[PDB]
RNA sequence: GUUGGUCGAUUAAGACAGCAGGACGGUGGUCAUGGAAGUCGAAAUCCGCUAAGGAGUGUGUAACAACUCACCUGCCGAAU
């Protein structure tokens, strides 16, 4: 499985189901038309991160916020933070307000156990 | 974790924790999650867990004794029949009674196909139909008794037959084979080996469910009281209609032998 | 009858079916124990084969 | 067997089969000892049972 | 046994079986003395209890 | 190589070798952006369940993965 990526809302797209193969292992513009329905979420902005799934003669990936799929988006910032934890590039601080509610969404999609783990949280695979 | 060194993974003070547990609570169960993946595992034990709750414990858990000794119960290396520790394996503590953590573990199974060098914990079969696989090395499906032929330039299973039976080990490739196929032959979780509950050591002929034999025994019993109170003449409540038909066989065998009015 | 298998388990474990025997694990089942019947029923039972009794009745 | 016949008495009388105070005490009285083991499994089957049906039934 | 024979008897008749005049009537003649307690139980059982159902069904 | 020493560790609460098992979830709330739960790459470091399973030694699906070993068990019975 070789993913692929997707900006909103877009089908067929040539530079992202030509050299990283047409999704399904043929058949491109099969997970293009899938996609674009639902991936049309927040605005196109910066690339998203999807991870493909195959089905029998059909290529669709379900983003529903799966972990992956916020990663860029969330922060809303075009650079990055690079070497983080000392000095942060941007000043792009994401709220609390929005931190919750899109942990919360990864946390049913994750294979995640506790609701009280989301406490425990964050560190290692975030802040760092 | 953080401390990823050899330096404490602490002996006296996680016996402890091990300690206060047993204590606590009425059952200590032994099951085995070494069968069990730990993705897997988290499912089982997340039913459980609201229950009361589960710890794993290294060879500070066989040591019993000591926290049979702090409560008083029985659970231990003496009094129990022998601890069934695995690799891998825990005790679990629940609030549930024995005929209920059999029922819970055995809803809530999650499909796995079987594992190398393990002994197949049932008979693992293949169905008839088309393997989904190319054609290839045909030859070793036969190896496995898997039987197939080449039918439209593809292999396809002929027949359905069982591939090897219980207690003999899986092979490197009955496993990689099965999962092809999309076959998971056991559905895996934790076997329950002993339950210890209130005093009491039950082996799994008590967890189990399966009775209708026992129903047969009550069917039985029934029946002598039945053929007992025919003959006796003893108007008692169930005897009482059974000893007039007794007086009545006597009426009735002279008629039917003989064509005798009366 | 309470009576009838409290005498039928007698028979199995191989201990007389008198009234001694019999009245006791009446006593055990938790229903009172009338004076005439478990006397009666033992002296009654007595010299009788049950076992051909049980594997007869048609 | 010992053990049939012990939750047997218990439904003919009419009582209800618990542990302690009819189902151990009846084995008992006979002068059989009744293993801890086995009775749960024999009471189970008169929990969420209709007995009756059993009862009517002779083999 | 004994004490069968003679409340049944006494029903094909369509006589009641008191205890002096049919119920112990019967096995007095054969020299056969009824036990008075289990004499009782006979007594008991006619009275009371639909006799017709009984002799009706076949075993 | 073999010898006796010295200073620390770990060890009958069963360690250390070797099989056999497990080596996951919080987790791709995040950055290389085409991308990387550890893994073509980089500053980083603690929990859940814990006895365990590195926010990572490699094998690798340009993804996941399981696999390996380092971590501990079952086996093992005395040192390492």
Redesign the pocket.
Request: aromatic share 2%; hydrophobic share 45%; glycine share 6%.
């Given at each position: 499985?070789?993913?692929?990526?997707?900006t909103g809302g877009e089908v067929g797209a040539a530079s992202?189901l030509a050299?990283?193969?047409g999704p399904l292992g043929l058949s491109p513009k099969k997970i293009g038309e899938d996609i674009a329905k639902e991936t049309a979420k927040d605005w196109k902005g910066?690339?998203?991160?999807?991870?493909?799934?195959?089905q029998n003669r059909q290529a669709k990936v379900s983003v529903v916020?799966?972990?992956?799929?916020?990663?860029?988006?969330?922060?809303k910032?075009?650079?990055?933070?690079?070497?983080?934890?000392?000095n942060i590039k941007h000043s792009g601080?994401?709220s609390?307000d929005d931190?919750?509610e899109?942990?919360?969404?990864?946390?049913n999609?994750?294979?995640?156990?506790?609701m009280?783990?989301?406490?425990?949280?964050?560190?290692?695979?975030?802040?760092? | 974790?953080?401390?990823?060194?050899?330096?404490?993974?602490?002996?006296?003070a996680?016996?402890?924790?091990?300690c206060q547990?047993l204590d606590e609570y009425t059952k200590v169960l032994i099951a085995v999650?070494?069968?069990?993946?730990?993705?897997?595992?988290?499912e089982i034990?997340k039913g459980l867990?609201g229950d009361s709750?589960?710890?794993?414990?290294?060879?500070?858990?066989?040591?019993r004794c000591?926290k049979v000794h702090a409560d008083n119960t029985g659970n231990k290396e003496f009094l129990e029949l022998m601890?069934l520790?695995?690799?891998?394996?825990?005790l679990i503590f629940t609030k549930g009674d024995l005929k209920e953590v059999r029922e819970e573990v055995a809803k809530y199974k999650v499909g796995a196909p079987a594992?190398?060098?393990?002994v197949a914990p049932v008979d693992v079969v293949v169905p008839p139909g088309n393997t989904g696989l190319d054609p290839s090395q045909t030859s070793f499906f036969q190896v496995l008794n898997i039987p197939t032929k080449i039918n439209k330039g593809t292999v396809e299973i002929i027949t359905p037959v069982e591939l090897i039976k219980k207690g003999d080990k899986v092979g490197s490739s009955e496993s990689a084979l099965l999962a092809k196929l999309g076959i998971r032959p056991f559905s895996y979780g934790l076997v329950i080996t002993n339950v210890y509950d209130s005093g009491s050591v039950f082996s799994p002929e008590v967890l189990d469910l399966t009775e209708d034999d026992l129903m047969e025994k009550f069917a039985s019993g029934v029946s002598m009281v039945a053929s007992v109170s025919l003959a006796i003449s003893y108007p008692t409540i169930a005897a009482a209609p059974h000893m007039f038909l007794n007086g009545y066989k006597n009426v009735l065998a002279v008629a039917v032998e003989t064509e005798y009015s009366y | 009858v309470a009576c009838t298998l409290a005498a039928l388990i007698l028979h199995d474990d191989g201990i007389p079916i008198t009234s001694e025997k019999i009245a006791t694990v009446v006593k055990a089942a938790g229903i009172k124990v009338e004076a005439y019947w478990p006397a009666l029923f033992a002296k009654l039972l007595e010299k009788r084969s049950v076992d051909d009794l049980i594997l007869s009745v048609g | 067997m010992k053990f049939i016949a012990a939750y047997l008495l218990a439904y003919l009388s009419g009582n209800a089969s618990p542990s302690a105070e009819d189902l151990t005490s009846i084995l008992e009285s006979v002068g059989c000892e009744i293993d801890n083991e086995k009775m749960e499994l024999m009471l189970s089957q008169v929990k969420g049972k209709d007995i009756t049906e059993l009862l009517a039934a002779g083999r």
């Open positions: 499985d070789v993913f692929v990526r997707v992202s050299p990283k193969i910066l690339r998203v991160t999807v991870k493909l799934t195959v916020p799966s972990a992956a799929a916020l990663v860029i988006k969330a922060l910032e075009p650079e990055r933070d690079r070497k983080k934890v000392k601080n994401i609390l931190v919750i899109i942990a919360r969404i990864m946390r999609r994750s294979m995640a156990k506790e009280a783990g989301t406490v425990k949280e964050i560190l290692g695979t975030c802040v760092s | 974790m953080a401390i990823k060194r050899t330096k404490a993974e602490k002996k006296v996680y016996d402890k924790k091990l547990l999650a070494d069968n069990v993946g730990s993705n897997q595992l988290q034990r867990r709750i589960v710890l794993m414990g290294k060879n500070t858990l066989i040591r000591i601890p520790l695995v690799g891998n394996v825990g594992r190398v060098g393990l | - | -």
